[PDB]
A paper describes a structure:
To characterize this new two-domain CuNiR enzyme, we obtained a 1.1 Å atomic-resolution structure in its as-isolated state using conventional synchrotron-radiation crystallography (SRX) at 100 K. To provide rigor and reduce the ambiguities in the assignments of multiple conformations of active-site ligands and define SDs of individual bond distances and angles of residues in the catalytic core, we used SHELX-97 [estimated standard deviation (e.s.d.) values available from SHELX are given in brackets]. A notable observation was the presence of two waters: (W1) and (W2) concurrently bound to the catalytic T2Cu site in one conformation and an alternative water (W3) in second conformation. Two waters, W1 and W2, with equal occupancies (0.67) are 2.49 Å apart and bound to the T2Cu atom at distances of 1.940(3) Å and 2.162(3) Å, respectively. The occupancies of ~0.7 for these two waters strongly argue for their coexistence rather than alternate conformations of the same water. An alternative third water, W3, bound at 2.018(3) Å with ideal tetrahedral geometry to T2Cu with an occupancy of 0.33 represents the site in molecules where both W1 and W2 are absent. The catalytically important AspCAT residue (Asp92) is present in both the main (occupancy, 0.67) and distorted (occupancy, 0.33) conformations of its proximal position, as first seen in XFEL structures of AcNiR, with these facing toward the T2Cu site. Although seen together in our atomic-resolution structure, these two AspCAT conformations do not occur simultaneously but are only present either alongside W1 and W2 (main conformation) or alongside W3 (distorted conformation). In its main conformation, the carboxyl oxygen (Oδ2) atom of AspCAT is hydrogen bonded with water W1 and a substrate channel water (W4) with 0.5 occupancy at distances 2.52 and 2.45 Å, respectively, while Oδ2 atom of the distorted conformation is bound to W3 (3.13 Å). The catalytically important HisCAT residue (His250) has its imidazole ring rotated toward Glu274 forming a strong hydrogen bond by its Nδ1 atom with the main-chain carbonyl oxygen of Glu274 at 2.67 Å.
Author numbering:
A (entry chain A), B (entry chain A), C (entry chain A): 3 to 347
């Protein structure tokens, strides 16, 4: 009855993004996606703490879906019988039935097919939402991702000029609530159900034990730093389904930032730090101007350095001494310096 | 000496709003309001927990006042002698004397009359502010509401086009700080004064025990869901006098959102989730496109589902299968499905 | 090799700001600043609680630096041998090398000279960032300030009209994490290193013990209230390097607010309360219209009244009864008043 071409999309694990066109002259299609729920224990920090997670497609965050305005998105949500709980999906991009949640509740061993029209442009959260207290628990257990609905003409600067990215990354930030024992050590559990009561108690106090990108402290540092090159315009999509965040690229800026994430609004320019409201996705474009390591953080630095929420970019290219230079390397304070006369002493 | 017509306004309890014109061709008037402080015990959650509250006009939030730009607002604040504490009022809409607080301190048995000129358009918080530590305590005990100052031409989209709402609701969100005993159960008290010391200790840790709309968990669910119809443009005013919130309409959007709440600024379009800075009111317009239940939450889902901060809309009308449809109802996973080959396993 | 004039700037302690031009017809210069790290015990509240602080130039916040777009900023960072730890500096205004942090690590007894080009307009945080867990600890110990990069034509309203301030103040807000003993009293320490382990435990819970302006509760009240006069347009720069804030001027407004702090974006008008994302600076202009005391707060009123985050302005001039007036002073409730008939009773 909807007589449009169908196109199957193969998702990829974050922070990477499946192939897509930015601008397109194709007309609306039915874009077909499959999301498979996977409940499993996962490692969430550098000390090896484990966690009873619930995911779409085995990752935290779930994968980024990319479509264009006016496409229809036909999602097969699958809940294999190796899982123990019912699940569903709420697309913040969609209109009606609790985002789809009221049409996608499935028991282990079931699947369901939801179609929603992509009438709203931007980046948007999707997440599980079974009902009642299960809603926050499934979300903070990992069941959230994002979808991007691009304008058919691609992005623009809000002032009539096209913007094109050379690279895209999806940073899903996750607040986790991990019980501790009387000795103060994180507790391990053999199933999500066994974890629940203790976890709910931590959730109620609204203070995460971990705040991570791509599912664990250190996930996007080390060998898994994000690559870029001087001159590239990089789109960084950031989502947080449950709790606020304040992204910042250390040594960079947000050249164009949609912090509320919706491309019908002009981006802000030249930001230092932006703000992702819990329950949303936002996006920032930055053209790299200097090589080296950059850290990408939430700028509650306690969260960034001590709870897990730091990623790295490794950027190749040539240093620009006009923008920044070390005029004099560290040296002993001159003996004839006069700092004892300064106003603050 | 101010020679303008006087118009008495009868307030109504939230989430409803007293009758008013959106656009008007009337000139400035003196709009007369009465607010009566009421200290009383109130029920704040579904388990029947009680709370020593302080209110304007017996409700949390206090009622929404609606005027137009250039009106004068003449408020009689009354503190009956059945109350035990002094009170005052701070209008964030007003200019001077600590919002009016420095001109309205009244003891039990007194009343005072304040007039302020509505020179600033938008939605704004009002709240009690007696002085010092009493300021946060009176506010988080319930003494806060909002006022809307409409442009005389009504709302517009920031791009020269009038916007008109068919319905308006006021959602006041309240962070509450309820002591617990050694057994972990919420404590009851016989007066606000007896509650204070234990309550201040909870306040100091900055984590509410409850986050509620219209004064209690479940207030706007059940029989008291908010009504609307497909096609109606609904204005949802949201205030929070002490603490941030991130509103979201599950299954909907914010078509036009003034998240900082001030109508001299163009609204943002097509938001998923917005942000109410503690100490402010904001507003969102949404035209309903689908019937059914919608949940309206703060999108810290722990707060929403576990601390009280969920409302419902019940929307009548006809479902639009073009926007969203269940293509296939829940069914067993096909035996010949191949999910073991998916990239994430 | 950079052949520009050099101009040495003498910094002053906050909340005051060194002398500068708003609009200028001078061309780019090399603007020379010196920042000296000082580790010392400081008093942070009205009860005399002490704290092992780390500062730039002896103050919390560090001083406001002011330059113009296209200037080069050449900073000599000095770490005297009376200090115990290494330090560095990250300018959110700068491009490359972790904001400068990767080029400025200095041991006690060393200094370094960094030059960065002021290519981005706005107010921006600067802060120490040595590496790893030392990053949040140095910041929340006090090592953060701000820099303002003005357009050469000065500020404008985003709609082609120049804005000029008569006065400028810099409000640096600081979240502090002070351990308590088993009796609940704040603990004192003899060095930052001795404080660290207990302090990190408080930091991990993400709830400050104190939230202060200009380094201590009460710093900008009393004798040190901020002065202004009716009619003056005052720029209030607000920074927070680690944690969100929601500024509000009680009895006033933000006439023009850059809450993300970047002057390539038009300001919002007529705000009640704005939002400083942790890790940023923002700015608000307000033209005073009434004399008297104003309080300037973060509008988590618990933070404002109970954790230290209130400043005052003392404004001289003549009261305007058109904007606000006490129509009737406090009086007994009339005997023939009818309040028992009101809808809420
Ligand atoms: Cu689920
Ligand atoms: Cu949601
Ligand atoms: Cu009161
Ligand atoms: Cu206020
Ligand atoms: Cu340092
Ligand atoms: Cu930083």
């Amino acid at each position: 009855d909807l007589k449009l071409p169908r196109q199957r999309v193969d998702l990829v694990a974050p922070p990477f993004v499946h192939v897509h066109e930015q601008a397109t002259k194709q007309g609306p299609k039915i874009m077909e996606f499959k999301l498979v729920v996977q409940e499993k224990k996962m490692v969430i920090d550098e000390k090896g703490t484990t966690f009873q997670a619930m995911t779409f497609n085995g990752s935290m965050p779930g994968p980024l879906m990319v479509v264009h305005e006016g496409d229809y998105v036909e999602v097969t949500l699958v809940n294999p019988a190796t899982n123990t709980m019912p699940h569903n999906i709420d697309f913040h991009s969609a209109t009606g039935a609790l985002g789809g949640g009221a049409l996608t509740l499935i028991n282990p061993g079931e699947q369901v097919v939801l179609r929603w029209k992509a009438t709203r442009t931007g980046v948007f959260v999707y997440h599980c939402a079974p009902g009642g207290p299960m809603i926050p628990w499934h979300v903070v257990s990992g069941m959230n991702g994002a979808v991007m609905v691009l304008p058919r003409d691609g992005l623009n600067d809000g002032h009539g000029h096209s913007l094109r990215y050379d690279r895209i990354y999806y940073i899903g930030e996750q607040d986790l609530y991990v019980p501790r024992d009387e000795k103060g050590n994180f507790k391990s559990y053999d199933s999500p159900g066994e974890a629940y009561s203790d976890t709910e108690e931590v959730m109620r106090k609204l203070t995460p034990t971990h705040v991570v990108f791509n599912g664990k402290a250190g996930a996007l540092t080390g060998k898994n730093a994000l690559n870029a090159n001087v001159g590239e315009n990089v789109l960084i999509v950031h989502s947080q389904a449950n709790r606020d965040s304040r992204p910042h690229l250390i040594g960079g800026h947000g050249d164009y930032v949609w912090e509320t994430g919706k491309f019908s609004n002009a981006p802000e320019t030249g930001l230092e730090t932006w703000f992702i409201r819990g329950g949303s996705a936002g996006a920032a474009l930055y053209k790299f101007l200097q090589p080296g390591i950059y850290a990408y953080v939430t700028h509650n630095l306690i969260e960034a350095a001590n709870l897990g929420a730091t990623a790295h970019f490794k950027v190749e290219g040539k240093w620009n001494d006009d923008l920044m230079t070390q005029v004099k390397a560290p040296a002993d304070i001159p003996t004839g310096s006069t700092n004892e006369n300064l106003y603050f002493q």
